[PDB]
Every structure is written in structure tokens, then in C-alpha cells.
Structure 1
């Protein structure tokens, strides 16, 4: 390969890791690096913003532990009225409901915390401070977890304004997962217009934005004028 292709391969893997579903080592790493930055920043409102963000992810992490425990406790119940197919079918469906409803509340609590983290960052008014690498990384990570919390519950239209704010910050636009999620969420919205028989202007708006971020994700991972880039361009043209 070329030096740029080798570099690119390394970077795409780092970006996929960056967007990894949360776990205890990633929680540690993510907060450890966000911890580095707030230290240098030495700004009480940024300190508060991170305190709220971390409380939000803690809600998510505590929920993930709850979901395993709940499924465990259900698995360990002896189910005597479950001898016919439909009976097991029900109890599976109710397990999905209780888990989904609790995950929905955990998401709502996590987003209230993320909203508070953003409201505290909003109080940093000095443009010399808002342009700090410390400011931009935290604001990016708050948006990323917000996007992921909604994404996991299939709330894809809601991820669009946050993905769009995300890619505007400090070269986030060059992240392959960011464009993949934008393209997928736009695709969903296009399909919503087709299923609900909505207006053509919105059909084409969503289709256009899907194709822009589809092609950009392709360019970023495979390179301009790669067999894969050429393919997506030829489909669009």
C-alpha cells in the first residue's frame, strides 16, 4: 500500500473504536482522556459540564448492568404456564417491552444530563476559550454519546441535528462513522416519507443528504477515485 492508505487503515480502526458501544474499559479510557483535558482547561463551568456528562454515561452504564441482571432473573424463573408456543412468544415480547421502557427512561435521564453538560458549556462565552481543544473534545463526546443513546433505541431522526453539530467541530467531518450514521439516519427519514406518502421536496432532500454522506463516508474510508468511490459516484450520477 501507499503511506496514506496505511495511515488511513490505522485511522479508520481508531474511529470505529471511538464510536464503540460503551463498556467498562472504554468508559475508563473515554473519561480518562476527557479527564486529562478539563484539568488543563481549569474552568469551573467546563468542570461542571464534564461532571454532568459523566453522570449521563453512568446512567447508561448502570442501565447496561440492570439489563443483564433483569434478563438473568427472568432466565432463572421456572415458567409453568409456558408450555405452548404463543406463551413463550408473549413472555419474550414482555421482556423486550420492560427492557425497552427502562432503556427509554435511562436514555431520557442520560440526555437530561447531556443537556445540562451542554447548558454549562454554553456559559463559556470567551471565544478564546470556546476554541480550546479541551472545549471541542468534550462537546464532541457529549454529542457522540447523545447520538449513540438515541441510535440504540432506533430514534434516528433525532440523531441528525446532533450529528450535524458534531461534524462541524475540529475535523470531526473527517470521521467515517459520523458520515455512516448521518447517511443511515437520512435513509430512515427518506423511507418514512415513502411509507407515509409525504411531500416530494422532503423525499429528495433526505435522499440527497443520504447520498452526500454515503459518498463522503466511502471517500474517507477507501479514498478518492478508489473502485468503491467510483462505484458510488456512478450510481448517484
Structure 2
């Protein structure tokens, strides 16, 4: 079952009384039909933010940005694959030394790395726009629908994956934590793998900059919790991998006997 097949949040169209209420309001708005009206006080028109029309429109804008961001990521890999194919197939009539091949190789790596970061940064802007569109859906009922949770996880996942590639690890922590609070994403070991690395980065920065000891411990404890959880979710509890991590964490943490 695909929740994004129809590309909509909630399908908008039953009671006889409700059908009568809808009839009289439509008649009233016809009397005061004035397309040039602009509400001086914004409170009343802002109630349109709670409508189903508004939520559908915001959902489709976020969907449009999400698709564009994924297109940015996917087209880049297509270009990188094509670029490597073209480089290997062209004739090198002036290359005869091993260090020349190493030199030619390094340029291709620099070109590829340069383009990848540009694609990641371009895609991240699309995802950040997609994130903002969903945040202004103010209706809690529409936020619990399967379609909303399907897109919300996909937008969060791609944004987290891209932001990590730009080495902006501490920014992924707030988004990752909101990711594992939706449906059963908490049982995914990749989610806890990223949090282990991200909190390790925070721990080093406090150690390096000689920050507060309290923040040093909190980043260390959060690092161990998600490191152990990721090990359990992938290799299982009381597994050889799990026993290895417990020895590491106990050695790293401070305990009292």
C-alpha cells in the first residue's frame, strides 16, 4: 500500500442537517460576494489555516519539494556514473607514467566530490522547504493520517541523510529525534546509527573546546544509548556484537562499585 499514490493528504468531498447548513452559508456568501475584500483584522482569515483545502495545498507543495530534492540526489548519481564511464573510455595519448595515472585519477575524484556536495546542498534546500511546508499544517487530526506520516518520515530521512553528507552532524540531532517518534521508526537501526555518530561529534567538541562537564557527559550518555540500541536492532541482544558494545560502553562510562 502506497500512501503517496494519489498525491493528496485527505480526500475531500453526508448528513441531511449538515447538507442544509452548507446550503445556507453558500447563499450568504453570495450576498456578500466581493473579491476585492481584504480583512483588516487577520484573525478571522487565519482560520483558513485549519481547513482541509489549506492542508491539501501545503501537503502538495511539500510533495513537490520532496520530489525535486530526490531528483537532485538521483540525477547526481546518474551524472557521476556517466562521468566515470566517459573518463575511462577516452584515449590518453600523453600518459605513460604511473604517477601520471595517479595524478589524472585525483582530478576525477576532486571533480566528483565537488559535484556531489553541490547536489547535496541543492537537494537540502528542497528538503528544508518541504519541512517548512508540513510544519504549518496546524490540524492535529490531519497530522495523524498515514499519508502525512509517510511523507513526514521520507522528508525527514532524506534531509537527515543529506545533512550528514555535508558534515553538519549536530543539525541532524533534532530532526533524527523527531524521526523516531513517528510510527515505528524507532526500531530502525540506521536511525540510531546516525545518532551515535552525531552525539560523538558533540562530545568531541565539548572535550576540544573545554566546555561544561555536564554537557560532556550528556552527549556521551546519549552517544552510548543509541550506539547500543543500533547494535541490538541489527545483530540482536545477547549476540557476539552486542557483548562487544557493552564492554566498550561500560569502559567508556563512569560507574561506581
Q: Report the TM-score, using the length of structure 2 for normalisation.
A: 0.66
Q: Report the CA distance between 1:71 and its aligned residue.
A: 0.8
Greater shift in the superposed pair: 70-79 or 49-58:
70-79
Match of 2:239 among 210, 221, 226: 226
Q: Within the alignment, does 1:45 sit opposite 2:58 as a pair?
A: yes
Conservation of the 8 A alpha-carbon contact between 1:186 and 1:209: yes
Conservation of the 8 A alpha-carbon contact between 1:180 and 1:217: yes
Give unmatched runs, 5+ long, in structure 2: 1-13, 251-257
Q: Report the CA distance between 1:203 and its aligned residue.
A: 4.6
Q: Deviation per CA, 1:66-108, whole angstroms, max 9, x where unpaired?
A: 1011111111222244322332222222111111111111111
Q: Report the CA distance between 1:180 and its aligned residue.
A: 1.5
Counterpart CA distance in 1 for 2:152 and 2:52 is: 15
Greater shift in the superposed pair: 77-86 or 102-111:
77-86
Q: Report the CA distance between 1:46 and its aligned residue.
A: 0.7
Give unmatched runs, 5+ long, in structure 1: none
Structure-2 change in CA distance of 1:42 and 1:195 (3 Å): closer
Greater shift in the superposed pair: 178-187 or 226-235:
226-235
Structure with greater proportional helix content: 1
Aligned length: 237
Conservation of the 8 A alpha-carbon contact between 1:143 and 1:163: yes
Structure-2 change in CA distance of 1:13 and 1:48 (3 Å): closer
Structure-2 change in CA distance of 1:205 and 1:150 (3 Å): same
Q: Report the TM-score, using the length of structure 1 for normalisation.
A: 0.70
Q: Deviation per CA, 1:28-73, whole angstroms, max 9, x where unpaired?
A: 9999999999999981211221111011101111111110111111
Q: Report the CA distance between 1:206 and its aligned residue.
A: 3.3
Structure-2 change in CA distance of 1:134 and 1:204 (3 Å): same
Aligned residue in 2 for 1:128: 141
Q: Report the CA distance between 1:14 and its aligned residue.
A: 53
